[PDB]
């Protein structure tokens, strides 16, 4: 506790990296198993450009379902805790692999979305892009109102480059950080998984919060097991008191 609490409380520029594990307690599967709708594919076999070219209706049906579930979900104790850490001025920037909007919904202000967002729909051809309040019904295939081309979810698919400006911004944030909380990520997906290494390489501390050991665990200064929500809730309660 005390050394961990002190590390967070006394941090000069704390950042965070979150993954699917912080949203499971809102009812959103981690998508480390199967696709969650048919349960016939690995999620990576649908979230890619090859699948979308083969059968855009199938891929859109999956995303429409994903969108509805997220839009109907509520933020949980982990999302609330991260928002509270920003509110208290400890957390400077929240980097997330998640395509849900539950961090924002909990009141997080400075969020970087490495893999885009289910709230965003964009054109496959022109530069048209917009946000949705609710999920489209599939079929029909959603078409761009500006040019008539096929629309797609505003997420980064496996095999696609992260938007250079987004990844660059995340890199600059971890280049400033003396402490990083890495919560609910399996530390497998690149280049996202390389971000905490930058903090360590520059002499900072890594606090891993995850129910299981990961490839990051060997270099994590602290690695906390248990349920993401419960651990983050307890952690922010202690940090708030420590700074009070």
């Amino acid at each position: 506790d005390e050394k961990l609490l002190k590390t967070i409380a006394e941090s000069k520029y704390l950042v965070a990296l979150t993954g699917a594990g912080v949203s499971a307690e809102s009812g959103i599967p981690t998508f480390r198993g199967k696709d969650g709708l048919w349960n016939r594919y690995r999620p990576e076999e649908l979230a890619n450009p090859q699948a979308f070219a083969k059968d855009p209706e199938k891929v859109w049906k999956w995303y429409a379902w994903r969108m509805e579930k997220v839009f109907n979900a509520q933020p949980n104790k982990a999302h609330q805790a991260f928002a509270e850490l920003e509110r208290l001025g400890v957390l400077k920037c929240l980097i997330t692999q998640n395509v849900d909007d539950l961090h924002e919904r909990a009141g997080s202000r400075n969020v970087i979305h490495l893999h885009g967002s289910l709230r965003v729909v964009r054109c496959t051809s022109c530069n048209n892009s917009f946000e949705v309040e609710s999920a489209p019904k599939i079929p029909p295939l959603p078409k761009c109102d500006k040019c008539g081309s096929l629309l797609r979810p505003g997420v980064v698919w496996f095999g696609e480059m992260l938007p250079p400006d987004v990844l660059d911004r995340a890199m600059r944030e971890v280049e400033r950080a003396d402490v990083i909380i890495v919560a609910g990520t399996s530390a497998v997906v690149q280049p996202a998984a390389s971000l905490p290494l930058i903090v360590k390489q520059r002499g900072g501390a890594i606090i891993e919060i995850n129910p299981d050991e990961t490839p990051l665990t060997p270099i994590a200064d602290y690695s906390l097991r248990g349920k993401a929500g419960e651990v983050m809730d307890e952690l922010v309660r202690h940090v708030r008191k420590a700074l009070s």
């Binding site: 893999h115 980064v156 696609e160 480059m161 992260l162 997906v189 690149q190 280049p191």
Partner: peptide, 8 residues
């Protein structure tokens, strides 16, 4: 690190 979104 960079490169395309991928599993390690």
């Amino acid at each position: 690190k960079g490169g395309a979104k991928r599993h390690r």
